[PDB]
DNA sequence: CACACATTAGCATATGC
DNA sequence: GCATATGCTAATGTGTG
């Protein structure tokens, strides 16, 4: 309910503190990584300050940023111190929608991609083709 | 675990200060 | 040139067999 407006107020104040402290969003991600271990990319911080992320994600990243703004105020010095593969895989589709792992290993060795990368890309290919 | 589908979060490049 | 906003899709995660 009002959690929406409370998040929005927190985000506006967060933008104000970030601009006042002279930290870029990539620097914010680096600080989050070096103070918690879960380094985040600057796109996530952008979508946060612009309030683009989903509600569950909104709540999930609220506490980390709360802690960073409540902690970093003390001292800053120590804290500071490809398309052809796509086309080939599309060619591999239209004939065998769900290949076996035996074929997956061959595909991975053929195009030089990691087995897990090819497996997840295959799953998401199926996913977006089953959207429609 | 793993995978069926939903969420999530980082990349390449597009804009902007 | 660096720093933000977008489109887009690897990657995980919920939930499960």
Numbering used by the authors: 140 to 220, 238 to 288
Q: Could you pull the original sentences from the published paper?
A:
Multiple transcription factors can bind together to a regulatory element in a cooperative way, and cooperation between the pioneer transcription factors OCT4 (also known as POU5F1) and SOX2 is important for pluripotency and reprogramming. Here we present cryo-electron microscopy structures of human OCT4 bound to a nucleosome containing human LIN28B or nMATN1 DNA sequences, both of which bear multiple binding sites for OCT4. Our structural and biochemistry data reveal that binding of OCT4 induces changes to the nucleosome structure, repositions the nucleosomal DNA and facilitates cooperative binding of additional OCT4 and of SOX2 to their internal binding sites. OCT4 has two DNA-binding domains: OCT4-POUS and OCT4-POUHD.
Our structural and MNase sequencing data revealed that, despite the presence of multiple OCT4 motifs in the nMATN1 DNA, OCT4 predominantly binds to one binding site in the linker DNA, near the nucleosome entry–exit site (mOBS1), a position overall similar to that in the LIN28B nucleosome structure. Both DNA-binding domains of OCT4 engage the nMATN1 nucleosome; whereas OCT4-POUHD is bound close to the nucleosome dyad, OCT4-POUS is located distally from the nucleosome. Nevertheless, despite its distal position relative to the nMATN1 nucleosome, OCT4-POUS interacts with the histone H3 tail via a smaller acidic patch of OCT4 formed by the side chains of helices 4 and 5.
